[PDB]
Each structure stands twice: as structure tokens, then as C-alpha cells.
């Protein structure tokens, strides 16, 4: 395919109002971006302009995001043979950041990088997270594409039938 | 070792390095000489 494909993928498009309307209507959004990156900041920047504070979460070492994000979770710091095994308990990340945000902030946006490595049920929970926490928006890079396109995360995870764009 | 005469290396001859190609040298020299002679002739002819 060509014509439209080889015509401007410029970053001056007026998709930003639709992007903000979608991120307000659909709380959890799957995002697809150029492989070399750097064309996501135009869309996250305006979210940060509305008072949203970003929490960067890597999905590779996420480790069962239910108890990692919404519960106190046990983690063992790495001993190198010089110490006995210690079991530390870490606070729920998204809730700690939520209760520690300033009162003027619009909310918290969870930027889940490399969300393709998560399974189906983990993406289900990541899509249904804003229902449990009202002031949380979920953005998850579920892949790469020539141009930035976003979909509801419930549609990708399988809660909503995948309507043709 | 500076005052010792047995420290001078004596191991024969090294493996010779590849020989050299000299034909393109003469070709380049002929090209430049012809260029200079053509310059002489052209300057004399065009000046008149």
C-alpha cells in the first residue's frame, strides 16, 4: 500500500483533541508508536500539561501486577552471599503515588512500557485498573507501528469486541 | 646488557615483504607529464 502511507506522518496533526477525548472517555489506552521512539512525548506531554503525574512501570519485571501495584508486595533484595536472605515489604506503587500526590494534581497516569510481554489476564487487569482506582489512567505500549495509533486497552485485552477501525 | 656483545640479535633474515608494482607509477607519471606538455602547448597556442 502507498499514497497515503508515503504521505506526511508529520507531528503537527490535529489528532490531539481526539487523543485527550479518548483518554478521558477510555481510561485505559493501548498505544502504538514508531520503532525508534520519541514520537510518544507529543501525546504524553499534553496529559502532563493537564496536571497528570506519570508513573513509569516496566512490564518485563512487573511480576503479577495485581499485588505489585494494588497491594503491599514482598521483594527480596539481592544478597551476594555476604548477607542472609531478607524479605522486604514494599508499598503498593500506584496507591502510594496516588496518596502522595499534591492536591492540585489531576491524577496519575501509569505509563506501562513494553506491555507486549504481559499475558492476556495481566492486560485484563491493567485495563480494569482505573475502575478500582478512579484517578488513574493507564497507557501501555502494546507494540510498534509506522505511525502513532491508539485503541482502548479493554478492546486489545479482550473485554470488548475488536471493532474494525 | 649494554656492555654485552652476545645480546646483538642474530636470527638470519626476516621473511621478505611482498614485491612492489611499479607500472601504475609510470602510468601516472606519463599522465602528469603529458598534462604539463599539453598545458605548455595550450598556453602558447591560446595566447596568440
Amino acid at each position: 500500500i502507498g499514497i497515503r502511507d508515503f504521505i506526511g506522518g508529520d507531528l503537527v496533526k490535529f489528532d490531539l483533541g481526539t487523543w485527550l477525548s479518548d483518554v478521558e472517555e477510555h481510561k485505559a489506552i493501548a498505544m502504538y508508536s514508531p520503532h525508534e521512539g520519541g514520537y510518544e512525548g507529543r501525546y504524553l506531554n499534553r496529559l502532563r500539561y493537564q496536571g497528570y503525574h506519570f508513573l513509569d512501570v516496566s512490564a518485563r519485571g512487573l511480576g503479577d501486577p495485581e499485588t505489585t501495584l494494588t497491594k503491599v508486595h514482598p521483594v527480596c533484595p539481592p544478597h551476594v552471599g555476604k548477607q542472609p536472605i531478607a524479605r522486604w515489604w514494599f508499598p503498593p506503587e500506584v496507591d502510594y503515588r496516588l496518596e502522595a500526590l499534591p492536591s492540585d494534581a489531576k491524577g496519575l497516569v501509569v505509563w506501562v512500557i513494553e506491555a507486549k510481554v504481559l499475558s492476556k489476564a495481566e492486560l485484563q487487569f491493567l485495563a480494569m485498573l482505573p475502575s478500582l482506582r478512579p484517578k488513574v489512567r493507564v497507557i501501555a505500549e502494546c507494540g510498534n507501528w509506522r505511525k502513532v495509533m491508539w485503541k482502548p486497552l479493554k478492546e486489545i485485552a479482550g473485554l470488548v469486541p475488536l471493532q474494525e477501525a | 646488557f649494554e656492555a654485552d656483545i652476545t645480546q646483538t640479535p642474530r636470527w638470519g633474515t626476516p621473511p621478505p615483504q611482498e614485491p612492489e608494482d611499479v607500472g601504475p607509477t609510470t602510468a601516472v607519471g606519463y599522465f602528469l607529464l603529458a598534462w604539463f606538455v599539453f598545458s605548455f602547448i595550450l598556453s602558447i597556442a591560446l595566447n596568440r
Binding site: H35, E36, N144 | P24, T25, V28, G29, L32
Partner: protein, 55 residues
């Protein structure tokens, strides 16, 4: 005395030839296909015993 100028001539043409040889050797690589793997649009398939993340 003339032999000095002649030797200067032959040790100058040689340098020009070898400079042209370097130019030719380098510019002959313009006719060859690139070896560059265009990451991240292209990824090299790892070996059967590549040591990466633990499972």
C-alpha cells in the same frame, strides 16, 4: 645534482599513485551493498545457544 631532482620526481609520483590507490580502494566500497542491520526495524536472529534473560 640533476639526479636529486629526478629522484624527487620519482618519489613524488609514487605518493600520488598510492594516494589514488587508497582513494580507489575506499571508493570501490560504494558499489557494495551495506552490511548495516537497521535496528529496531530489523532484528538479528539470535543463535540457538544465546545467553539472555533467564526463564
Amino acid at each position: 645534482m640533476v639526479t636529486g631532482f629526478i629522484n624527487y620526481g620519482q618519489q613524488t609520483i609514487r605518493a600520488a599513485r598510492y594516494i589514488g590507490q587508497s582513494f580507489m580502494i575506499t571508493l570501490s566500497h560504494a558499489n557494495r551493498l551495506p552490511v548495516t542491520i537497521q535496528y529496531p526495524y530489523e532484528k538479528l536472529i539470535t543463535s540457538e545457544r544465546f545467553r539472555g534473560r533467564i526463564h
